[PDB]
Design an enzyme around this catalytic site. Structure first.
Site, PDB file in Angstrom:
ATOM      1  N   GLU A  77       4.742   8.770  -3.803  1.00 34.38           N
ATOM      2  CA  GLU A  77       5.555   8.293  -2.692  1.00 34.38           C
ATOM      3  C   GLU A  77       6.354   7.048  -3.076  1.00 34.38           C
ATOM      4  OE1 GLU A  77       2.768   8.162   0.585  1.00 34.38           O
ATOM      5  OE2 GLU A  77       2.959  10.324   0.924  1.00 34.38           O
ATOM      6  N   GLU A  85       0.864  -1.177   0.000  1.00 33.55           N
ATOM      7  CA  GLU A  85       0.000   0.000   0.000  1.00 33.55           C
ATOM      8  C   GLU A  85       0.907   1.236   0.000  1.00 33.55           C
ATOM      9  OE1 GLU A  85      -1.369   2.956   0.247  1.00 33.55           O
ATOM     10  OE2 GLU A  85      -2.528   2.917   2.125  1.00 33.55           O
TER      11      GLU A  85
HETATM   12  N1  LIG Z   1       9.965   1.263  -0.255  1.00 27.63           N
HETATM   13  C1  LIG Z   1       9.555   1.140   1.056  1.00 27.63           C
HETATM   14  N2  LIG Z   1      10.084   0.231   1.876  1.00 27.63           N
HETATM   15  C2  LIG Z   1       9.691   0.096   3.133  1.00 27.63           C
HETATM   16  N3  LIG Z   1       8.739   0.857   3.634  1.00 27.63           N
HETATM   17  C3  LIG Z   1       8.154   1.782   2.873  1.00 27.63           C
HETATM   18  C4  LIG Z   1       8.537   1.972   1.539  1.00 27.63           C
HETATM   19  N4  LIG Z   1       7.775   2.979   1.015  1.00 27.63           N
HETATM   20  C5  LIG Z   1       6.953   3.402   1.941  1.00 27.63           C
HETATM   21  N5  LIG Z   1       7.187   2.710   3.106  1.00 27.63           N
HETATM   22  C6  LIG Z   1       6.428   2.730   4.346  1.00 27.63           C
HETATM   23  O1  LIG Z   1       5.174   2.219   3.783  1.00 27.63           O
HETATM   24  C7  LIG Z   1       4.057   2.530   4.650  1.00 27.63           C
HETATM   25  C8  LIG Z   1       2.910   3.026   3.768  1.00 27.63           C
HETATM   26  S1  LIG Z   1       1.332   3.176   4.667  1.00 27.63           S
HETATM   27  C9  LIG Z   1       0.661   1.476   4.481  1.00 27.63           C
HETATM   28  C10 LIG Z   1       0.797   0.677   5.773  1.00 27.63           C
HETATM   29  C11 LIG Z   1       0.210  -0.750   5.698  1.00 27.63           C
HETATM   30  N6  LIG Z   1       0.656  -1.556   4.556  1.00 27.63           N
HETATM   31  C12 LIG Z   1      -1.280  -0.737   5.596  1.00 27.63           C
HETATM   32  O2  LIG Z   1      -1.820  -0.699   4.501  1.00 27.63           O
HETATM   33  O3  LIG Z   1      -1.965  -0.800   6.741  1.00 27.63           O
HETATM   34  C13 LIG Z   1       4.580   3.646   5.584  1.00 27.63           C
HETATM   35  O4  LIG Z   1       4.655   3.178   6.945  1.00 27.63           O
HETATM   36  C14 LIG Z   1       5.972   4.047   4.984  1.00 27.63           C
HETATM   37  O5  LIG Z   1       6.935   4.396   5.986  1.00 27.63           O
END
Ligand SMILES: Nc1ncnc2c1ncn2[C@@H]1O[C@H](CSCC[C@H](N)C(=O)O)[C@@H](O)[C@H]1O
Ligand SMILES: C[N+](C)(CCCS(=O)(=O)[O-])Cc1ccccc1
Ligand SMILES: [Zn+2]
Length: 641
Positions: free
Chosen positions: A127, A118
């Protein structure tokens, strides 16, 4: 701590439609692999709380590798996974996914075959979804893997909209003088600028249909297939359409959806209400909303005469153009204005009713021989003061960029020799800056670029105090006074972004609640949050009340100003928050509000952010509020009583 306190994690957990559709997609994906007699190995990129990996284990996954770059959230996920009983099948890795490796000394034993992420923002790709997916397919996942979501589609719709175009262009500003009507025109380079190279993200569902004319169907511009190799390379996509109406092509509205399964039966969409079949089935969230983009120039389209809309993107950014009738790096601002004035500020300067209201205020206080000093960033008030008969006008611009922009506006309007721009911090101006003259009228909106909360514009009052020695006897200040106001409200939806969840789809997420709670209660006093409440329906539960009053005609007192009181809840509803805003007494018989403008749902000044103090997460609310003159801070506590 504030990054945690005002993160979007709480909103996600309350996003029922998101969580239901992911769960459905994850059960289907894991079953497709298990039904083939294969081991189901999940890579969950950006795991946050660990929610989607926990879903995957209940669905039958053999193991999950849950990646989270943000250390405090990775630590939370470990605890959440343990609380929910999944530590044996989920490994939390506190790295960026592009640093994750497969090998004897690596993070993973082998490539995964179910790819869950996500990683999306309102622009879909802002992002880093594209380079993250690109790297994952190159190094971390098998060919022919399952992906949840399986694909995304970006949609666009061309419209004419004076309101939204007014966030991008400066319109002529009219002012009535003794000699007749005068017009303030924009510099030609503003008219020709592509604008700021950034999306304007808004709750598009709160824009009235009366505010725009639809010129195209909803066009699917491009799609991303997450189940195959994804590229982060730049690309462009041209889609032909037949205009639905004749008008000025100005604004591109955009949003995306995601399909959770190969068959596209399970979908989440960010489409606004007029592009869906039933407004009563609309799903609210804040962590994802909709996009407003501007064409690099406006131009006419004709109903029935086909044109091509072009979506451009690179690894993070999206932008739009309308292909020539006959008939690429992203354009940047070359007029200065879009780097200095944000979208709401553009709209504010373009509000002719507002301008007229300041004009009438100035007519009242502009006496013969008036020597004016104007203080407010990028303000047109100095031009109004001149046109309305000021003898001499000074204005302060504290950045070189703003200094140059205002001089340019003055020059194209042939006022270069009537308004003197001082390039200093306003509290530091000197006698010589005023050419040895005393100021008889100190004026401002007040507005400053750096202000984040409504009372930050009390910097004007600080300046008034600092330049006291340069004021003539009997000098008048405009506004002559200001006041802080509050009302208790029930939010339709916004309460979700700061409310605990406790349980999400059967999973214990109290640890996430506790973590958020700990961060927003770190200080002795909780801070109010700025929000544009025109985008967030709410209704009042109390009468509005004046909380503090500030006499601009006098210097700032050297002792803090404190106020205490109670606000009676006069209407039924849940007391989600206290909303606070500034009002300004421009003249003895003129006022302006930056908050409530119907003191049904509340109506808010659309040009300004209001401050929201969320209540503890019952028919009176008590308050304690205090203004601190050394810092300009206002501390506050509201609580049910
Ligand atoms: N390439 C990457 N590797 C690891 N973490 C990442 C990333 N890109 C974004 N993030 C992390 O990804 C998260 C996106 S929010 C989604 C959180 C969870 N999967 C859910 O759906 O409940 C955030 O905590 C951000 O810090
Ligand atoms: C914080 N100050 C020192 C001024 C700084 C404001 S700025 O961020 O516009 O530079 C003191 C201050 C005092 C009273 C009101 C408002 C501010
Ligand atoms: Zn520009």
């Amino acid at each position: 701590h504030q990054e945690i306190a005002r993160s979007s994690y709480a909103d996600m957990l309350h996003d029922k439609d998101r969580n239901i559709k992911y769960y459905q997609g994850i059960r289907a994906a894991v079953s497709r692999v298990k039904d083939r007699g294969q081991k189901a190995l999940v890579l969950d990129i950006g795991t946050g709380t660990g929610l989607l990996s926990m879903m995957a284990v209940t669905a039958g996954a053999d193991f999950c590798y849950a990646i989270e770059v943000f250390k405090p959230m990775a630590e939370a996920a470990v605890k959440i996974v343990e609380r929910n009983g999944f530590s044996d099948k989920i490994k939390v890795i506190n790295k960026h996914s592009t640093e994750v490796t497969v090998g004897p000394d690596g993070d993973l034993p082998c490539r995964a075959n179910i790819l869950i992420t996500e990683l999306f923002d309102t622009e879909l790709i802002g992002e880093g979804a594209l380079p993250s997916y690109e790297h994952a397919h190159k190094h971390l996942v098998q060919e022919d893997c399952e992906a949840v979501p399986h694909r995304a589609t970006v949609y666009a719709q061309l419209v004419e909209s004076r309101r939204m175009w007014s966030w991008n262009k400066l319109f002529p500003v009219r002012v009535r003088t003794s000699l007749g009507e005068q017009v303030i025109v924009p510099p030609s380079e503003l008219e020709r600028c592509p604008g700021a190279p950034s999306v304007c993200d808004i709750q598009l569902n709160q824009v009235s249909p009366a505010d725009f004319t639809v010129l195209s169907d909803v066009l699917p511009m491009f799609s991303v297939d997450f189940s195959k190799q994804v590229s982060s390379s730049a690309a462009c996509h041209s889609r032909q359409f037949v205009p639905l109406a004749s008008g000025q092509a100005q604004v591109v509205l955009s949003w995306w959806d995601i399909e959770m399964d190969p068959e596209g039966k399970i979908k989440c969409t960010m489409a606004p209400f007029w592009a869906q079949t039933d407004p009563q089935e609309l799903q609210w969230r804040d962590h994802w909303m909709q996009c407003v983009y501007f064409l690099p120039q406006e131009e006419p389209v004709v109903q029935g005469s086909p044109r091509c809309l072009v979506a451009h993107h690179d690894d993070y950014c999206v932008w739009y153009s309308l292909q020539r009738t006959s008939p690429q790096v992203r354009p940047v601002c070359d007029c200065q204005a879009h780097l200095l004035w944000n979208r709401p500020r553009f709209g504010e300067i373009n509000d002719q009713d507002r301008t007229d209201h300041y004009a009438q205020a100035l007519r009242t206080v502009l006496l013969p021989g008036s020597v004016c000093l104007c203080v407010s960033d990028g303000s047109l008030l100095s031009m109004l003061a001149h046109h309305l008969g000021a003898e001499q006008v000074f204005t302060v611009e504290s950045s070189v960029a703003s200094y140059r922009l205002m001089k340019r506006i003055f020059k194209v309007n042939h006022l270069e020799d009537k308004i003197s721009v001082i390039n200093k911090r306003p509290e530091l101006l000197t006698a010589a800056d005023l050419e040895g003259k005393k100021v008889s009228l100190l004026l401002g909106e007040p507005f400053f670029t750096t202000s984040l909360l409504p009372w930050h514009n009390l910097y004007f009052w600080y300046v008034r105090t600092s330049v006291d020695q340069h004021l003539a006897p009997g000098a008048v200040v405009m506004p002559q006074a200001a006041s802080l106001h509050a009302v208790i409200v029930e939010f339709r939806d916004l309460w979700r972004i700061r409310s605990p969840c406790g349980d999400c789809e059967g999973f214990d997420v109290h640890i996430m609640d506790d973590m958020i709670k700990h961060s927003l209660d770190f200080r002795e006093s909780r801070e109010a949050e700025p929000h544009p409440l025109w985008e967030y329906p709410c209704r009042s539960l109390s009468k509005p009340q004046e909380i503090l009053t500030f006499d601009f005609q006098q210097p700032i007192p050297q002792q803090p100003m404190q106020s205490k009181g109670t606000m009676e809840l006069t209407r039924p509803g849940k007391s989600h928050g206290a909303v606070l805003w500034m009002e300004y007494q421009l003249t003895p018989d003129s006022t302006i509000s930056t908050g409530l403008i119907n003191p049904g749902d509340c109506c808010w000044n659309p040009h300004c952010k209001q401050a929201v103090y969320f209540l503890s997460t019952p028919r009176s609310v008590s308050y304690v509020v205090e203004f601190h003159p050394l810092t300009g801070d206002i501390t506050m506590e509201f609580r049910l009583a």
